[PDB]
Amino acid sequence: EKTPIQVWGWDYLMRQRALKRPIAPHLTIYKPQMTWMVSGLHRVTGCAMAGTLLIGGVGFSVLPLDFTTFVEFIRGLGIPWVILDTFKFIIAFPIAFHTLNGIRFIGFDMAKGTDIPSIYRGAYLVLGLAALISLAVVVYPRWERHKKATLPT
Amino acid sequence: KRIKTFEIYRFNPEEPGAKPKLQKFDVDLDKCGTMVLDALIKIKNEVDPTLTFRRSCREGICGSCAMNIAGENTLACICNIDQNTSKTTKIYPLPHMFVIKDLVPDMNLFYAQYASIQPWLQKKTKINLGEKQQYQSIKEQEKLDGLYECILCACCSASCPSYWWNADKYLGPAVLMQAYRWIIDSRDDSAAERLARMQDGFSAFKCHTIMNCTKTCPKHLNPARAIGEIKMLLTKMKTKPAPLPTPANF
Amino acid sequence: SNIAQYKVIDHAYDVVIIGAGGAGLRAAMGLGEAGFKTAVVTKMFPTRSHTTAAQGGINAALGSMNPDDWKWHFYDTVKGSDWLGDQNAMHYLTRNAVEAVTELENFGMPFSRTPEGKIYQRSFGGQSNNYGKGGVAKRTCCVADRTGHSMLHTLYGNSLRCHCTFFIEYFALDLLMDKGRCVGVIALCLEDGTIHRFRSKRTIVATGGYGRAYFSCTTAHMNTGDGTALATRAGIALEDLEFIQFHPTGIYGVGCLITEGSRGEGGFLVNSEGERFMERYAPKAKDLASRDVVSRAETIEIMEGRGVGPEKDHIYLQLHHLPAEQLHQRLPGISETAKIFAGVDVTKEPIPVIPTVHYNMGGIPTNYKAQVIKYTKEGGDKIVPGLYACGECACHSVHGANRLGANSLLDAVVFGRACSINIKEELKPDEKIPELPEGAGEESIANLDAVRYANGDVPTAELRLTMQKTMQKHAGVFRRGDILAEGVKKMMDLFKELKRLKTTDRSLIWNSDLTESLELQNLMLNATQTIVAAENRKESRGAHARDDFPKREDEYDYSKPIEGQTKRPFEKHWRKHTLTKQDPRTGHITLDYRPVIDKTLDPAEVDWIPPIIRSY
Amino acid sequence: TSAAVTGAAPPQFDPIAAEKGFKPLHSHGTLFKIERYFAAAMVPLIPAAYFIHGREMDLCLALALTLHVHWGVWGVVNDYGRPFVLGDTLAAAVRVGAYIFTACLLAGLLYFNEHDVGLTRAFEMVWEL
Ligand SMILES: Cc1cc2nc3c(=O)[nH]c(=O)nc-3n(C[C@H](O)[C@H](O)[C@H](O)COP(=O)(O)OP(=O)(O)OC[C@H]3O[C@@H](n4cnc5c(N)ncnc54)[C@H](O)[C@@H]3O)c2cc1C
Ligand code: HEM
Ligand SMILES: CC(C)(C)c1ccc(CNC(=O)c2ccccc2C(F)(F)F)cc1
Ligand code: SF4
Ligand code: F3S
Ligand code: FES
């Protein structure tokens, strides 16, 4: 159900359609900025994590393949470790970023740090920590594994 | 000589089967004022009088000349021409608006949405209209700084992707900041009713904190902040303070 | 309608208002409140109107800063006018000011505030306490540096409460006349190219000024005198057009106004010797002298070699001695504008400024009730039935030969309100909306068609530019008989070049080539009439200064006592209004003259103010 | 010529006439409040899941992610599922499909947690690679 202005606005959209007027371009011409790109990344990371959870949970259930034979399959391909650890980074970054930037967006909801300097600092900060955390979580255990392979007892 | 190229969106609604185009024009920066509007005027005057755009004031106070220049919503009349003659400047209408002609969008939904916030002073107790000044403290009227300066240009709303997709139901940054302007005015008694007009899932809550509005505002205002403030009032995290009492001797 | 076919659409309204600036919107509010079906026809969204560019403030004796009296504001207005203003109108203006400004605050206008929570007021040019014997007045009420913006947005918002119907981006072509009675308006709808005839019991012209007649102005591109042109084409003589206000401080480069409020708050003008020279031209009021005097002063400094900048052709407005908190609190708008348009930080550097065409005290003549009038010597003032005018397009005359700062926003609200009051009182629910005469508006459509398809060799933009440069050179700050006469010749020749007009855009939908060409025709009527009025007026009064006639020419020599003198007859002196009557086809102008009204509306409430010698 | 037709008023939103009989719509404020509190509450959950694993954490994640994602995709569907571009019936259908999304998400997660390795161990197994 609609407010009167929302009803008025529907009838407006239909008038403009009837007039066959074009819509001025938008996504294809607007300057990429730390405002709407980070927002976009927030939505993409959110939805990618969701989509992965759906396709994963239902997929494995509907298929004969289970996750243990899936993991063993890709080890079987024996692909270089730097690339394996990049996949891990990619898996980790969305979680890191989306969580961090989620906190930022809740602040925006409460009218916190909406001045342009703060908008930009927070963006860079959130992208930075997210990358730093995803890096750590991948690198640290790889470090331990190199120590286990080449150091005594 | 310094020849700057502009690529300008064109659209002629009277030609049958007309499509929008991009038209390059060359302009001598040494024979033209420093602002993009100057170039638009020079082109219209000296090359192509069919070039059509809105303009009026010369100092960025009217709001008529809003458009998208080099990817950003701004006012042609106070946007310095980029003097790097090796790059072209693209000029498009305000994004995701229905175009009437060339750089002239249909603005009537924006205006109708402004009307819907009831942008006028409302009193619970009828007032004798010419009789006396209402009391307002310095601190209270200064809450309106950042708010009253809006020139209703629509750069912010035409920068907002949520407004791009759902203009018919989402009021957009410009109208929401004005709605807030009437809500935090200590002289206005209708704060609760003003809030209730945009209680639904779309009117104000379809702000997804994208922040393009505050970023692009040519008057350096902050619609984003005002929407956060509306969200707080709507979620009852905050209230409107009561008016300061009018002194006995006033 | 010769070559194309036009979709014509008919409307029926109690009143049509042409204009949606301060005046048109205030009128509309009063009429809608009184239940009249009201159409607002405006060639741009209301809020783009030039009112919105106004900065410095609006006068009313609220007494927020010190005691005050509306009669003191009256006095300054009359003296301001240089005794060419009609005192019954100036009385009406100043008597109603406190109430008008209080209304605006009551509508929600966010006026700056004093510590007591009252409307903050600043000083301005040419105003005083105790009938000119006291000190400098402070009755200029303001929303910082943005009072016009704030007033217009307030008025527009309030007009939405009163069910007026808005026809936005409709360009008015002519008044619809039936035997000397105005029965409506005809306009072009830009959105769809349709032509609209508005039938109305009354019509209010509230169309602003014609600053764009000149090469350099502070005014919007839209200030093309369309209203005064409409009146001319309706057979109505225009009044006092030679009286053009040059504002002292337009930014040197581009013409952007820098408010007089900057001087009001303590700024001052400096020449190339670092001298505060207004102390020499006006030892009492100094930089807060009237606008005609300050602008003349600056221009003399330039002539006599004390101009500033690389070409020694302008003046400095110094503000940097003021505290940064005051500059930001009181003058934020021009602070930003000076930075964008001159690269100047006002806390540190002066603003380069020069006198710039700014306001038109001339326009459509009305009586004090804002009813448009025609005048003959034999019959006196006769109202044009159906037709009112207010705002800058009018000549009430509340400004006479020189408009006082902050009186025009006042003027627009007060007389815009007056229109609604006078219409409610004199218009009865018995009178029926008139039927249009056959063929009504058909000539306006024919002119539209011919301009739209114009075929000649002189494009509208060249012709506009020569008009503007011509006016700048020949009808400037200081004028002279031979320069004016040469100006008249060039201008009446340019009027002839209109037949050679070239346009290119053939469309009907949002054709600004077409609308700007209509505006050029409109501007030529105003300009041609302005300069011939200026050529004939052999005196120096207010904003009109003749080097070959340096004195103000009244019924008496007011520089000497009155006892003993014999009065000069009307035909010998110049304390009288110019009426210019133009034939729109041929461009031929005849001149008549109409007496100044010296009486007030009520001698029991306020005394009329006899002329004296005008000094600040 | 001016052999003409009678006009009507332009389309114009009358804020007073539109207000006649307008009973306010239910307030989305409280729902919006909880959505954000919930998201804040999940902030500690994500690092907690890094340090503590097993089937009970797997269950906490499944439930919290499902609720959060429910509200999430519902907002996405309402942004892009626009009647203007899809028509009324297809728009309605994508609104329903958001609930089908949530339902299927949880069911597949419960499956995964109950008959496969579970979320936390799944991460271990990829990280060990
Ligand atoms: C830069 C600047 C600053 C100023 N500052 C101050 C100040 O601080 N204080 C003060 O008292 N005064 C000031 N003035 C003077 C004052 O603002 C104006 O004289 C006054 O506001 C004019 O009001 P108006 O309603 O008569 O006309 P405007 O506000 O100019 O409105 C004209 C209206 O008529 C309409 N119109 C015109 N032609 C047509 C047509 N053909 N068809 C349809 N519609 C038409 C327009 O669309 C517009 O809505 C200033 C002037 C300028 C230029
Ligand atoms: C850990 C802390 C998390 C926080 C604080 C958080 C916060 C948020 C917030 C505030 C939004 C709203 C964005 C908007 O409306 O503009 C959002 C959206 C979303 N989140 Fe999360 N989130 C978190 C974790 C997750 C996780 C783990 C997923 C996994 C699938 C997820 C999926 C989504 C989705 C799909 C949206 C969609 C809505 C949109 O883009 O607007 N979130 N999140
Ligand atoms: C992923 C990429 C292609 C870069 C992209 C980025 C940004 C957009 C525009 N953003 C959006 O559409 C958007 C993004 C996040 C939240 C809400 C929205 C909304 F629906 F409200 F607009 C669209 C597309
Ligand atoms: S906020 Fe800034 S951008 Fe949005 S309208 Fe008001 S001025 Fe234009
Ligand atoms: S860009 Fe749009 S989504 Fe909200 S913060 Fe500004 S309004
Ligand atoms: S012309 Fe007025 S804002 Fe640009």
Residue numbers in the entry:
A (entry chain C): 34 to 186
B (entry chain B): 33 to 282
C (entry chain A): 30 to 645
D (entry chain D): 28 to 156
Can you list sentences taken from the study reporting this PDB entry?
The enzymes of the fumarate respiration are anchored in the inner mitochondrial membrane where complex I (NADH-rhodoquinone reductase) acts as a proton pump that is driven by the oxidation of NADH to NAD+ and coupled to the reduction of rhodoquinone (RQ) to rhodoquinol (RQH2), while complex II, serving as a RQH2-fumarate reductase (QFR), transfers electrons from RQH2 to fumarate. In contrast, mammalian complex II catalyzes the reverse reaction in mammalian mitochondria, where it acts as succinate-ubiquinone reductase (SQR) in the aerobic respiratory chain. Since fumarate respiration is the major pathway of energy metabolism during adaptation to a hypoxic environment for many species of parasites including adult A. suum and bacteria inhabiting anaerobic environments as well as some human cancer cells exposed to low nutrition and low oxygen conditions, the pathway is one of the most promising targets of chemotherapy for both parasitic diseases and cancer. In spite of the similarity in amino acid sequences and three-dimensional structures between A. suum QFR and porcine SQR, flutolanil specifically inhibits the enzymatic action of A. suum QFR.
Two very promising hits, NN23 and NN28, were found. The IC50 values of NN23 toward A. suum QFR and porcine SQR are 0.0055 and 111 μM, respectively, indicating that NN23 inhibits A. suum QFR about 20,000 times more strongly than porcine SQR. This is a significant improvement in both potency and specificity for A. suum QFR as compared with flutolanil. The structure of A. suum QFR in complex with NN23 reveals that the trifluoromethylbenzene ring, like flutolanil, interacts with the guanidino group of Arg 76C. In addition, hydrogen bonds of the carbonyl oxygen atom with Trp 197B and Tyr 107D are also preserved. On the other hand, the tert-butylphenyl group, similar to the isoprene side chain of the bound RQ, occupies the channel between the quinone binding site and the exterior of the A. sum QFR molecule, making contacts with Leu 60C, Trp 69C, Met 70C and Val 77C within a distance of 4.0 Å. This conformation allows Leu 60C and Trp 69C to establish contact with each other as is observed in the RQ binding form, which might release the possible energetically unfavorable strain caused by the binding of flutolanil. On the basis of this structural investigation, flutolanil analogues showing higher potency and specificity toward A. suum QFR than flutolanil were found. These inhibitors, NN23 and NN28, possess high conformational flexibility as a result of the –CO–NH–CH2– linker and are able to bind to A. suum QFR without causing the energetically unfavorable strain in the enzyme as shown by X-ray crystal structure analyses.
